[PDB]
Amino acid sequence: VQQITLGNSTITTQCRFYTLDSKTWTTGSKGWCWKLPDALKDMGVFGQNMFFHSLGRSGYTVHVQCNATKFHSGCLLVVVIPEHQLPGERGIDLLLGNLLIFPHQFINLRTNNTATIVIPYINSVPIDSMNVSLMVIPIAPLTVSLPITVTIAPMCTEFSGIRSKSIV
Amino acid sequence: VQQITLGNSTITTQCRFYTLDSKTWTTGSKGWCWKLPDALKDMGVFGQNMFFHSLGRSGYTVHVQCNATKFHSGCLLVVVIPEHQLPGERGIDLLLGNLLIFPHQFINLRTNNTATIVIPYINSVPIDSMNVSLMVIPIAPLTVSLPITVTIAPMCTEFSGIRSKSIV
Amino acid sequence: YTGPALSSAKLILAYTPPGARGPQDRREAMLGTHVVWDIGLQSTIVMTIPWTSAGFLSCWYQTSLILPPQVYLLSFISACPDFKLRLMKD
Amino acid sequence: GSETDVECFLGRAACVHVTEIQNLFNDWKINLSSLVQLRKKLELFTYVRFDSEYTILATASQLVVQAMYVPPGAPNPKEWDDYTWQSASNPSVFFKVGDTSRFSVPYVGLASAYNCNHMGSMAFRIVNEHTLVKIRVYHRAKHVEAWIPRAPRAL
Amino acid sequence: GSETDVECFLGRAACVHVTEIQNLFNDWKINLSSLVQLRKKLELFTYVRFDSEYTILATASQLVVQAMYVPPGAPNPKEWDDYTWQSASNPSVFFKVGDTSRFSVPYVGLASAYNCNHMGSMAFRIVNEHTLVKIRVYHRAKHVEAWIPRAPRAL
């Protein structure tokens, strides 16, 4: 219904949930950018498996929710770019019209306050050393700041068999 | 046959094998003593689970093997005492006739060089905070030093469900 | 092993997978992939390295050599039938 | 609507490299990023898998040409009396000056597609011993497969 | 795994002999031991049986070329006005300078395979009477059969 529980975590919105630090959307902010899995390199048990195993493979489900009242205006564009080119769990605090080609889900405070994106593993090799970058851009400015919460759930994750192989 | 492989480990004798430091049986040594699981508190992945989980429960299989030629004399008594009373992976370098009441397996260099003891979980409670002590006593003195290797395999091990429970 | 038949020791043959750093202690070696090998009991030990496309491989003394009243190991290499060879060179 | 197919849109012969030899040699590391009219159409896809057809045109001004292909990870020639030219492993084509040669390298990569990536290199010499020749190589992408459309580059 | 086959590993065209004629002649006794990159791969087998394909390339510098094959046990030409050149028994090919000829000698031996062995000889002349031509012969081993793997040579 509205209480998705995954592993030892529980979230309310409409394999565990890692909630990154809540960002403050002020009227002059350009947006934010989080490379994956780099945003989870320090994130408990995932950060340990990611460092310990030489190669890995993971999908992600990103829930971006902006807790606010029904009085605020403005809209954010949450877009995931595969293989973005020229930070940790703190992200990168910051043509645009063409970014809609990439999987996206506009949040518009007038109508919506949540966006959910299921990201599959996208690479030119089946397994790789631990790739995609999530960006949150405020398009229409905020008229009354408002908190932005990013929740990443890595799912369907596999890692290499080496260091666990017996030589007999 | 003679190559028991358990997990990422392989041993030759006649869930993983933890081989403690090899002790030198000189002609004047009184023996050694290793409390379990205290001998494994610093032993990789077991030491991590043992510290991380508040309560636990484990059985053990101890293989004591003394690599030597067919020219040496003497015999060791390998005995496991449940709840022994008045160290780490280094053990405690040290009436006796009655110790045969406890599960034991004399190694006698004339005939044998290996002893295997399967220890079940023995306690007055079904689960407990991480109990038994293995002792190796040279009874007949060694006549020509000889190395003593202790290998502990914790098996049928369970740990508490707390810290992994969802509150929903 | 080529030493005399009465000699004995326990040698640990540890495999470190590709991407990791080689061990600098018997504990590091024993904690990772490894085969404890009693030289007296078995003259020959055959390992099979996992699939690779390189890793490190080392051997450590668990017990000192019990020489009867220097000796040598001979090491051999080959490839399993799953080994491929793709592009020609000069 | 056959002109919107990716074999029609990307699979057409353009001039990728133009060099000049003397009677000594020139080697070009294959990079389709050098031609901005082919790179602008190819860099709107992340990954792309394609075989290739190289048609080399040689013209003289004031003879035989040895255009040798070099597989990825193999050394390039450094002089005009090197041993790489005589080496059997690296393919080569010997054609007269004024006409054109044509060969077809298969998809040479390490990953299942190129990400806009070692395609190899071509080395060119004129074999006669003891005139300036202009070499134009035309590349055509074959059996193309594309997989993630990107935003087109504006700058 | 087609590149580990012995027709793929040994059966590829390399430059085995390079000579120069004048407008007089040159004869080369066929020996694939002259090219150390082909000998290093061929001398890891004791016995080897293979037919052959010779592709001769002639280039001029400052015309017709008579590249005549000579079967094992037959005399070689000693001048440029000898009778061996006019002899019917020994095969020959007449091609213009600048392009290339191609022929295919069968397995010519006395034993059932060569042991790394009389392959014969090729003689080269230019036919015009009253310029320096460079001849490059490329040999390709065909239908190869190998039979005793040896230790590879280190020195």
Cβ separation C17–A55 shorter than 8 A: no
* Chain D residues touching residue A122 (CB < 8 angstroms): 148
Compare all CA atoms of chain A with the CA of B163 and give the residue at the minimum distance.
Answer: A8
Q: What is the Rg, in whole angstroms, of the alpha carbon atoms belonging to chain C?
A: 16
In the sheet that E92-96 helps form, which strands lie side by side, from edge to edge?
E25-29, E121-125, E64-70, E92-96
In which element (H, E) is residue A23 found? strand A23-25
SS3 string, A25-48, reads: ECCCCCCEEEEECHHHCCCHHHHH
Which pair of tokens denotes residue E35? 């090219």
Cα distance between residue D80 and residue D102, in whole Å = 23
Q: How far is CA C43 from CA A88, B40, C1, C5, C78, in A?
A: 52, 31, 5, 9, 19
Q: How far is CA C80 from CA A160, C49, C51, E44, in A?
A: 20, 9, 10, 21
Residue type, A83: E
Quoted resolution (Å): 3.9
Pairing state between β E47-61 and E114-115: antiparallel
Helices (H) and strands (E) in chain A, counts: 1, 12
Which pair of tokens denotes residue E47? 């016995």
Among A151, A141, A63, A87, residue whose Cα is nearest residue A109: A141
C contact chains, 3+ CB pairs < 8 A: A, B, D, E
Cβ separation E8–C86 shorter than 8 A: no
By the 10 Å C-beta count (0-12 exposed, 13-18 middle, 19+ buried), D153 is classed as exposed
Cβ separation C87–E3 shorter than 8 A: yes
Cβ–Cβ < 8 Å for C17, C50: yes
D contact chains, 3+ CB pairs < 8 A: A, C, E
Q: Which CATH class, in words, describes the domain spanning A5-159?
A: mainly beta
Cα distance between residue D111 and residue D113, in whole Å = 5
Compare all CA atoms of chain B with the CA of A166 and give the residue at the minimum distance.
Answer: B8
Q: How far is B12 from chain A (nearest CA, A)?
A: 10
Cβ separation C68–B70 shorter than 8 A: no
Cβ separation C89–D89 shorter than 8 A: yes
Pairing state between β B114-119 and C33-38: unpaired
* Chain A residues touching residue B17 (CB < 8 angstroms): none
**D131 and chain A: CB distance < 8 Å anywhere?**
no
**Which residues, 6+ apart, have CB-to-CB distance to D36 below 8 Å?**
none
Cβ separation B149–C31 shorter than 8 A: no
Method: cryo-EM
Which pair of tokens denotes residue E54? 């010779």
Cα distance between residue D104 and residue D110, in whole Å = 18
Domain coordinates of chain E in residue numbers? Answer: 1-155
Three-state secondary structure call for residue D93: strand
Question: How would you classify residue D95: left for phi > 0, otherwise alpha for psi between -120 and 50, otherwise beta?
Answer: beta
E contact chains, 3+ CB pairs < 8 A: C, D
